[PDB]
Symmetry: C2
Subunit: 125 residues, 2 copies
């Protein structure tokens, strides 16, 4: 009846994910199920624990994000797959591009992340 549900749920996940990413990373566990999977700069991590942990150790202090584009589509298995392209500035590190992906699933009547992929857009020299 207007803006697709997967586009409401998705942008709403993105929003909540990044905010939490900038205020208290040790709280990300709640948006992932136990059988989750994360890929950070080529590196894969399985299970909730190993994910939260990995994210808790990133050497950054202040981080900011600017969602430049975000695409959402429903999948055959009744899931929501999202693609994010944007930019971030980590402390006084130079502004850089990046892309992320999320696969949300409805569990306990709440949408939770099962798959997550992140990778900085490396400058070419």
């Amino acid at each position: 009846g207007d803006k697709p549900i997967w586009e409401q749920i998705g942008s709403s996940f993105i929003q909540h994910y990044y905010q939490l990413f900038a205020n208290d990373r040790t709280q990300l566990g709640a948006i992932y199920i136990d059988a989750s999977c994360l890929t950070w700069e080529g590196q894969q991590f399985q299970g909730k624990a190993a994910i939260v942990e990995k994210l808790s150790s990133l050497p950054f202090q202040k981080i900011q994000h600017s969602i430049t584009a975000q695409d959402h589509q429903p999948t055959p298995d009744s899931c929501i797959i999202s693609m994010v392209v944007g930019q971030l500035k980590a402390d006084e590190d130079p502004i850089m591009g990046f892309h992320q992906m999320f696969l949300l699933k409805n569990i306990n009547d709440a949408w939770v992340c099962t798959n997550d992929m992140f990778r900085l857009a490396l400058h070419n020299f």
Copy 2:
């Protein structure tokens, strides 16, 4: 090499080899209920999707992957995400991002979800 990587890599090679050579046959890696979001525009169904890709205003588009990540999901699917460069005819080289959600239907891996984005230098 993890099995999910073998499937995904083999799929993107097949996908970009078709995309560079014969775009009109790109239907071979989609299903009728496939969905594509290109530069923000959505094309639902194999018919729409192929027609969109097939008619892009150019004779040849090359694609070079700068990096590719793959991953398996709880419900037997595979997510492939690429970041690389492409060049349409004589047009200048441009960055892009692309993600594919794969599933095995009819005993064959096919793409059900496809999102593409051009890089903003």
